[PDB]
């Protein structure tokens, strides 16, 4: 109902946890599990390609379609461009319908 | 043999080591000679040639003005600007539909 | 300094005439050419295909291109459409430029 493409097996949830790491355990051994643990974080980096399968344009329409733009006139900023203090932002909500069909 | 002069714009200026970046004297920066092209070439500072202005006639002289800038004849011939140690080895020529002797 | 591709040999001319039928000729032998025709035109179908070749955008821009677009807001025509009596008007010339590349 919201967007997108129903999937009864859609792509799978990748889930990620570092592995505890504990501090020193006492000499005298305990019954009860290690609360006490380093404190500790991980990085790296991810790619994700998808392929995607296109349906192209075969209108036989004369006049000219809609398209999507940027509008020409001046402006302090680019528009889905980074700001003066670095902070990248999307203006508008795109909508992926523009081109036209007969019903 | 006048090297007392230099063109304005024209010409090349190198800095010495350690030379400030603003308002340093001229004993300070290194200055190109161009004067190699002396042969094909025309001085920077002075006009190509001289051009007459208007038809003479009896009652009217021949009047002659001074060509300033002169584009370019079919039957010209130059020589590009030289190479030194401190210059730029290359350029990219600008992606457009015409270019005449894209030469830096 | 117009526009378009000049070139040295470009596609020739086709020329067309309606050959001369001429009317009745006396019945004495005269010298003169003969002066008198019969009205005459003719009419046909031409077909013109042209194979272009096209240089593809590469571009590897983030943000958002300008694009040439009919504007959404309703008109009592369709630009580039037929009249209400049957004539074909185009409202603007359109240019070749909008894609950008560097400079």
Redo the contacts between chains.
């Keep these: 109902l919201m967007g997108g493409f129903g999937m009864k097996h859609p792509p799978p949830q990748i889930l990620i946890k570092n592995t505890p790491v504990p501090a020193d355990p006492p000499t005298a051994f305990n019954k009860d599990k290690l609360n006490s643990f380093i404190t500790q974080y991980s990085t790296g980096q991810v790619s994700v390609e998808i392929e995607w399968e296109l349906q192209k344009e075969n209108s036989k329409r004369?006049?000219?379609?809609?398209?999507?733009?940027?509008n020409?006139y001046k402006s302090n900023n680019?528009?889905?461009?980074v700001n003066t203090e670095g902070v990248y932002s999307e203006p508008r909500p795109i909508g992926t319908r523009y081109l036209t069909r007969n019903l | 043999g006048e090297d007392r002069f230099f063109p304005l714009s024209g010409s090349l200026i190198f800095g010495k080591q350690g030379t400030g970046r603003d308002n340093v004297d001229a004993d300070k920066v290194m200055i190109t000679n161009e004067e190699e092209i002396k042969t094909t070439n025309p001085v920077a500072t002075e006009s190509y040639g001289q051009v007459a202005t208007n038809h003479q006639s009896a009652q009217a002289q021949a009047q002659t003005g001074w060509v300033q800038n002169q584009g370019i004849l079919p039957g010209m011939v130059w020589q590009d600007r030289d190479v030194y140690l401190q210059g730029p080895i290359w350029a990219k020529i600008p992606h457009t539909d015409g270019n005449f002797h894209p030469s830096p």
Tied chains: 1, 3.
């Design positions: 004369w006049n000219p379609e809609i398209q999507y733009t940027s020409y680019v528009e889905f461009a």
